[PDB]
Symmetry: C3
């Protein structure tokens, strides 16, 4: 509940309950220095639904303008659709909460958090995640927590926790870390990391560039704060310790109950690894399609009408066996090694009559990036509880239905599009030129012509290429890449008895299936000198520093390779387009 950062004063987080929203299943009011107020209320449905196929969890943040003491500027004088920052905060709170419930739950859960009072010099995302975690812990649901989040910024080589807006502009790197306590040592679920806007000028004058070692040190520094916050959530003045409640059982719907495993694993486990050794896309299935058909045919003698259960058992068995094959043989599905990158192609000036256009292809990902320019008056004007009003860089991300082959309805973007666009924009901001040198309004649009998985950083590279082609002077090109990590308790029979120990394997250019098979995923973006944007999320209970460092160096090597590949086409700013405005 208390944070001492050293010479920058102290911060206090307070958690109150029992006074507001008594009718809800759980409700917690969060105080930041008795100056910021917010309220989190979580309720659960009574009768679960059965037609749905996943866990129906909903999050709703509500920014209210009366906190800022200003009537809304809308024509009808009312706050309507959620803002982009609200959607980003909703995603940030939802991400470390879904992998914390009992699998297969069916009762609907809704978490509503509303801003009550906001200091103009502070932000509310971390307070929001803390209050939501405390409320859902007090709710009484099968929730495996509590979770704790901390925001830490690097200034003058020091990692100060919970910085304000007046302290972040003079920082070189910012962390938002969400983790829990397993046995006393923290276990991080997620982290979101961004470099500030003026990092280049700061590091030029003597400051330390945000390299990978600094990132690891920053991730290490945030653990005591998370531990203190979790302890406060557990045993504050009004916490779960003083408000013990009975736990009500919730019905759980599993994919396979008890028996389909004891059949399939004993009848359909010949090799289940040699069928995937063909290595040809046109001959991918080639053996195990017949295996699946024969299994679903000949097993239709004891379990009738339960094809979903047999499908779930088959897919789970295949996933486990390919995981074991990955761990032992170090042989990927596509035949690539653990440090291989798929085929690359970069084309410049593909769309005519445009200020800048480029096409970037990696494996199956294929992204077309277009950039335009106009008068400086065209900058976006926004107003919310946040301290941001102007936005000279407008990045839009489009994921049409025909990218993945399915059919749907083209229309309003989802939250995933907002998240990916925000991530790419925040990765590309720090290298932008100054307004005085280059006064213009830059609108970059990235359309997903073809997708297979992890296509955001392909869009990042394509946007860099298009910005360079348009003639915009960038300080240095910025690349991106995605990496995965599989950790498992493997058994070696060299001793008696079989010794079980944890082993880690890091993979490059993970597809959707690769992400499904793995347990940790992360994405690294940056330039030749330092990283800019980082996003990590997993469900492990600990990780040695050596393997994390090695994965970071592998990511750096892959990013350098991608940068060198992309620099072959165009490495210098191009001539201004005749249609561009002066």
């Amino acid at each position: 509940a208390t944070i001492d950062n050293g010479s920058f004063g102290t911060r206090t987080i307070r958690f109150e309950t029992g006074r507001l929203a008594l009718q809800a299943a759980g409700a917690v009011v969060a105080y930041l220095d008795d100056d910021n107020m917010l309220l989190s209320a979580t309720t659960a449905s009574k009768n679960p639904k059965e037609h749905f196929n996943f866990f129906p969890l909903t999050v709703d943040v509500e920014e209210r303008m009366y906190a800022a003491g200003r009537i809304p500027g809308s024509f009808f004088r009312r706050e309507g659709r959620p803002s982009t920052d609200a959607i980003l905060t909703c995603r940030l709170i939802d991400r470390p909460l879904r992998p914390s419930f009992v699998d297969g739950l069916r009762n609907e859960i809704q978490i509503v958090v509303t801003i009550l009072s906001l200091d103009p010099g502070d932000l509310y995302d971390v307070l929001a995640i803390n209050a939501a975690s405390a409320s859902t812990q007090l709710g009484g649901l099968p929730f495996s927590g509590p979770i704790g989040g901390v925001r830490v910024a690097l200034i003058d080589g020091t990692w100060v926790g919970f910085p304000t807006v007046d302290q972040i502009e003079r920082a070189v790197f910012d962390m938002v870390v969400a983790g829990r306590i397993v046995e006393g040592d923290v276990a991080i679920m997620m982290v979101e990391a961004e470099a500030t806007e003026n990092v280049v000028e700061l590091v030029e004058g003597g400051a330390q560039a945000p390299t990978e070692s600094v990132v690891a040190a920053g991730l290490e520094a945030a653990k005591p704060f998370i531990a203190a916050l979790c302890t406060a959530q557990q045993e504050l003045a009004d916490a779960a310790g003083k408000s013990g409640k009975p736990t009500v059982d919730f019905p759980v719907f599993p994919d396979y109950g008890e028996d389909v495993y004891y059949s399939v694993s004993s009848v359909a486990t010949d090799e289940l690894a040699a069928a995937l050794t063909i290595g040809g896309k046109a001959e991918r299935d080639q053996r195990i399609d017949e295996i699946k058909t024969q299994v679903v045919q000949r097993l239709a003698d004891t379990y009738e009408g339960r094809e979903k259960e047999v499908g779930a058992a088959l897919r789970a068995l295949t996933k486990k066996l390919v995981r074991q094959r990955i761990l032992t043989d170090h042989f990927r599905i596509d035949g690539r090694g653990i440090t291989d990158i798929r085929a690359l192609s970069a084309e410049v000036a593909v769309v005519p009559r445009a200020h800048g256009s480029a096409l970037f292809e990696r494996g199956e990902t294929q992204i077309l990036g277009v950039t335009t320019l106009d008068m400086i008056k065209m900058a976006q004007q926004i107003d919310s509880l946040g301290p941001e009003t102007s936005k000279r860089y407008m990045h839009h991300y489009n994921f049409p239905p025909f990218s993945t082959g399915e059919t749907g309805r083209v229309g309003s973007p989802k939250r995933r599009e907002i998240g990916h666009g925000a991530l790419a924009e925040r990765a590309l901001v720090p290298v932008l030129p100054s307004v005085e040198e280059f006064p213009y309004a830059i609108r970059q649009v990235s359309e997903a012509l073809g997708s297979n998985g992890s296509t955001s950083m392909g869009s990042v590279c394509a946007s860099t290429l298009a910005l360079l082609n348009a003639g915009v002077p960038l300080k240095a090109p910025v690349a991106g890449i995605a990496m995965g990590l599989v950790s498992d308790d493997i058994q070696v029979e060299g001793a008696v008895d079989g010794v079980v120990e944890r082993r880690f394997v890091t993979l490059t250019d993970i597809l959707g299936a690769e992400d499904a098979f793995g347990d940790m995923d992360f994405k690294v973006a940056g330039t030749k000198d330092f990283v800019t944007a980082l996003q990590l999320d997993t469900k492990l209970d600990g990780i040695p520093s050596q393997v994390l460092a090695g994965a970071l160096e592998q990511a750096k090597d892959a990013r350098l390779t991608i940068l060198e590949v992309m620099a072959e086409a165009i490495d210098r700013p191009d001539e201004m387009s005749p249609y561009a405005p002066r």
Copy 2:
């Protein structure tokens, strides 16, 4: 069809049909003085649906800008979403129409009324309800009407019917009354009453304040107009008399057909009143949960798969028996008396960094009110067929899903929120300070932290508290309260044979269950001197003046008690907030 108010000329309402919209089931064109034109068309579906659980009735008013001779100001030059006044009129017409059809109907009904020509000095809500009632009467549906609505304003001690905008600003009280004819004497279903903006200055100079006796006199004065309008609807030039049509039977889906009553009322009617005498919230059920389980278990021998029917029979039997217990023992479910008010709590300056903030709790209702101020330029700009353009007082009402414990989707407000917010704003307007003395833009927001039933006037009191805390000088604090009334034909055995006669009981602070058990509900809001906002709606066929007057005095006493309770915390305007703007 004709209204003679005395020295203020006469008004004429005309109902025409047979010329427009022949394809519809019913269609009526309404003329107001041959200067206002509107059209009402009602149609019914053919095959009723079965998955729905209530009566699917829809109302749609359509304000068209070409009546005002002005191109819409929208960017796309088209009238899109309905306006707030349209939603209010939709609610006003829908309210006295739902309790007029055969219960359990399943065929969808849609009533669409569109404005065709509007005089800038007149309103259209009462003409709308009249035209819709006439059209649905001509449709041929199982509709028990017709209904009639009248607008009556009090000026110079006289109740003039159908006032214009140039006559309402000099009034002290306004009535909209909707009623029908049962045996010759009118039977009012609904009434909506509001005090004007400049009532204080008018009553200060010699006019009569709108007290409860004046309200009763005004409600009494509107009956002849309703009778004349109903007679015109019945027997005008083009009415139901000259346009007789066959009545087509519509399938009716009941909760219990014929037999579940003869079982449950004979096997599960031991006391059904002693089980609710526990009086503890944690021990509320405590006897009748087991009764319900045993009834639904042991009766699963003749009716299988009809648990909905047995549930409906059980709930109806319990409602009837608790109604009888209320009538005879005068003992409420919670143990409170017929003139009791639940626990009260008022807190001021609860939300920091705000111009004004307050919290008000009554029983289970818990409302947080916040008020902010800004420049006078921030006044809301609107434009419609109505004569209103500016709105210095902006009241918003929020009902989040977690107030009542359920889960839903937070998003666009429904019509109930619009109605409650409009009611609270109209109740709080007349006491506002003048623009010259207090030039500011006032935006009040009321969020329902906790709800149990009838939480709008809790929001009214909370908004009054927040406005006082912000430093806004109000003429007098304004309170609100809700009351219920149960009337039933009780039998006394003191004579031979058993004498059946009507008895009335008035209850204070009605919950949802109390509203379900009763037959009449009303809500009274106002200050220590006079009332401001009134809303009444019921389904009775008559009421003596004495019981209505007594209920009004009981409401006045409860409102005075609430005002005295709330005045203990803060009774004077507070200091201006340092974050507030100076203008």
Copy 3:
């Protein structure tokens, strides 16, 4: 792929594939003179749905502002809802594509076409339809094409193909023709025709007015271009010839499989034409309702639970027999002749307190038109990839649910409303007065009080009446009308054996049932001198010029009759309303 219009240079259309959007079922990039770029991608669902009752086909055009090199003017700086021109183009591409698939298909089909680069002096609708047709041909679906579209404008008596914006303002008539190849000669499915804004001044100085013969000549002139475009689609550098793909079978759900016909046609075919000879609206059914009830009752012995199949068989049999009766007896259902017009009524100044108001009734169609005026500042401001920015004439079309008797939800307009409103506005534009003479903002609204079928041109006439009543000086009143055509292979037994030959019958004032029974429908609008708006759509494989010409003259006669009927009420501009605003 190449268009030579004579002295106006040449145009080139290029179709590329295999480079973009590989994951889709089909994808084609379209080049217009290497200056306009667009992309069409079509994909199909895997498992078809069964609860739906029609073919689920969706079209989506996407105008992207980065083609014009301009940040969107929206508050959130993003292109949101589709524009009116986008909806019109969506309808224009969807219309000649639905009657080209195997009937009863259930797999969902989605066609998404996005603008990539647009020349400010060119349009994209015809390139859009061409690219979509090529993509759906390359997709591998059961698609009976390919289709070709051509835009042809008449300037100086010459029909130049693919005109630009700098060439259309000096034209007298514009055609968009979509047709295919059956045996070598083209077969037109659809055509959309409009007269330019300044046609009156042009034809006054010596140019030829766009009469019916000129329309027929223009429809004849566009065929070689369609043939060349279809040949290019078939055998270009990257076309279906070099990209042969297997055809995957798609399940087909029919209304009646094989047997219900052999029962109903043998047991319930006594006359099926005498039951409809009553001629009274209140006694319409009067015989065949009992026939339907007895058929559905006594046949419930072999097919149980298949009432939908028996209903489909009954309705199909009735349609075929009434078609034969129409062909042979020349006797319509309502008893009217082949050149009859239903009852007409026109009323002026019906809605009080309005600049102009009128009511027009024809048969069962009943339309109330209202027109208002305001300051010239009130002109609509729009911005898109198109070259249009201002719109002084704003026509709105409303179709409330209670017009046809059903119940629904009143709200956002559908695409049909947009299409009908755009058609009426484009028909009424060329006769509008000049801005300098009549500086005002004109907003006309047409509400469908009662509808039976083909009620758009009733709205056109009502809007003309209301504009005349408001005092707006029009050059000449404009009327509209709808006509149908039924062509069938009838057999005459005067020779041995029975000689089968094609016969055509043209009908006036077609209702919904008449449109269902027929095979060709068209709508003609215009003034006493020339036509303005034309819209034709059918599914024939050829038509002689003589019958088309005769149908055109019949339409002209009906339009003249309607004009003479409507001119009886008011024929001159009326006095300005006291509520109207004055600009002086």
